[PDB]
Symmetry: C2
Subunit: 319 residues, 2 copies
């Protein structure tokens, strides 16, 4: 259905989905919901060139954690590196569904991505995945040489709940005093377990990500109300003092997205706390505009991805 | 350099490599040789759509063996399946270097590919990789339900030394009396540890795969002369009785390939032994025409890949 002002190809995409019908995502089993994203991402020819992908399993904070290391192809020597935390509402998502987005960030930045295969929900609940995410980030900082990266030049990045994860890993790194981070790339992040922002009200349905989906995503992640109030679940709830000293951020938000307002609000809180922030709203876009392969050639999406890669590159340079 | 009759795009490719210079592959460390293929495969935009890839580790014949299961996207239910053994001269190759070839076979056949991550040489020597290859093939036959396939409808496939591996797994399955195989797809296979065929003499240099490379590949695999004489290393040496009862085969050979004659000779031996064989020489082509991403849009290559997928499909049907 969409709205006046939705970018033309995105609007066509929304209409094609409406005609296709099918059950609301949140009425599916996690397995069947996962298959929706898998199938949709696979239905589109996309450019995945210019990268070399290798899996690595690490022992970090008491568990085995699987990584996918995505390196710019045909480049010798140590490279700087960004952790990549995937979206999908905690229930969905994985490496191959996100590979095109990751590839675009790697090719556009010249930096290595370290995808972390965190445990999905509801198989696990908060704070399992963020603890794995942080553990892997600390491991890369310490052991980067083993995977061809300079762990001292380290950023965090992610889309959607992965943007939540990147923001929270940055907070955990501050709390732990390690590792040092150059940059946080927050792509249309989830930042608050509340559903009353103006954007949540305006875009509740008809714009791909629905309020119904977000509540289901949060419910699968954790139904503990006290957990949801913690800054490691809802970083928007952090005080200025808690946010002070966090790494420079680029926050991209989508105009037609229930999560738009909380993402922009988080950018404002970082700014009020003295953190360097660039906050950019991509007009015409829906949530996960940079993830969804059917939208990967939309010119505004390409421009957003060029920016995301360039800003990673700018913040990951030698001194 | 090439020759009169090399297909036009292939000839341009050979000339571009000649101008680029660089050391002979066999003068590189295994690590640096592996990087040559990795980098070259990554330098080309290719279509990888229409598949879903998932890794699976199995316990088979006393070891952990890593698989990549490549399924046609958006398809429900049990599907038939082919093992995929990668090429690269035993020293080189892996899943991502071969992903486009595998994808083409999966999309074109509608069957699931099971890539087997056998141990490279010289890290291991014969018969380590073929024992892993067979073990994984027997595992899929027995446990197919666990990875969404019908293990009773099982083929083997591979390119180059992977074609050697597929042929040898078929012989091992005959010797072991299990599992039943529907089909063997031998894409420009290595079949004999000898270097005196007319094609070896004619195409020793200038056509990408050189005699120098083949001797180095064999040396890394095994320098045991007695091992090389075994049919599980050199299947061309098998007698008619040893070949009797093997599954139907499609053997594609390349016209401009040192390995052309031994591949065609193996097809003849299968035929003489009563095995159903279709043996097709793709004129104008060099070795690994179906692997190399810079050649993936050459019309003859697309036609060869359409055939390979179709023949898999034909032999993997219900009764």
């Amino acid at each position: 259905s969409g709205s006046p002002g939705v970018e033309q190809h995105t609007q066509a995409f929304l209409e094609a989905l409406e005609q296709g019908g099918g059950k609301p995502l949140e009425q599916l089993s996690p397995k069947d919901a996962r298959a929706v994203l898998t199938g949709a991402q696979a239905s589109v020819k996309v450019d995945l060139s210019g990268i070399e992908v290798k899996e690595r399993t690490i022992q970090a904070n008491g568990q085995s954690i699987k990584l996918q290391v995505v390196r710019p192809a045909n480049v010798k020597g140590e490279l700087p590196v960004f952790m990549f935390f995937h979206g999908g509402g905690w229930v969905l998502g994985d490496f191959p569904t996100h590979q095109r987005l990751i590839r675009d960030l790697v090719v556009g930045s010249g930096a290595v991505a370290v995808y972390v295969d965190y445990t999905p929900s509801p198989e696990s609940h908060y704070p399992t995945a963020i603890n794995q995410a942080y553990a892997a980030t600390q491991w890369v900082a310490e052991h980067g040489k083993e995977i061809g990266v300079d762990g001292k030049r380290l950023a965090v990045a992610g889309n959607s709940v992965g943007g939540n994860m990147a923001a929270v890993v940055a907070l955990k790194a501050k709390e732990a005093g390690t590792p040092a981070l150059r940059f946080q790339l927050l792509l249309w992040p989830v930042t608050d377990a509340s559903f009353e922002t103006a954007s949540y009200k305006q875009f509740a349905d008809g714009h791909f990500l629905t309020t119904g989906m977000m509540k289901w995503f949060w419910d699968n992640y954790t139904t503990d109300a006290k957990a949801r109030e913690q800054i490691y679940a809802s970083p928007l709830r952090a005080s200025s003092e808690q946010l002070k000293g966090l790494p420079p951020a680029l926050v991209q938000t989508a105009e037609f997205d229930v999560l738009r307002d909380e993402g922009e609000a988080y950018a404002r809180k970082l700014n009020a706390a003295g953190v360097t922030v660039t906050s950019v709203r991509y007009n015409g876009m829906i949530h996960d505009y940079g993830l969804l392969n059917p939208l990967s050639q939309v010119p505004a999406v390409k421009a957003a991805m060029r920016q995301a890669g360039t800003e990673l590159k700018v913040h990951l340079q030698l001194e």
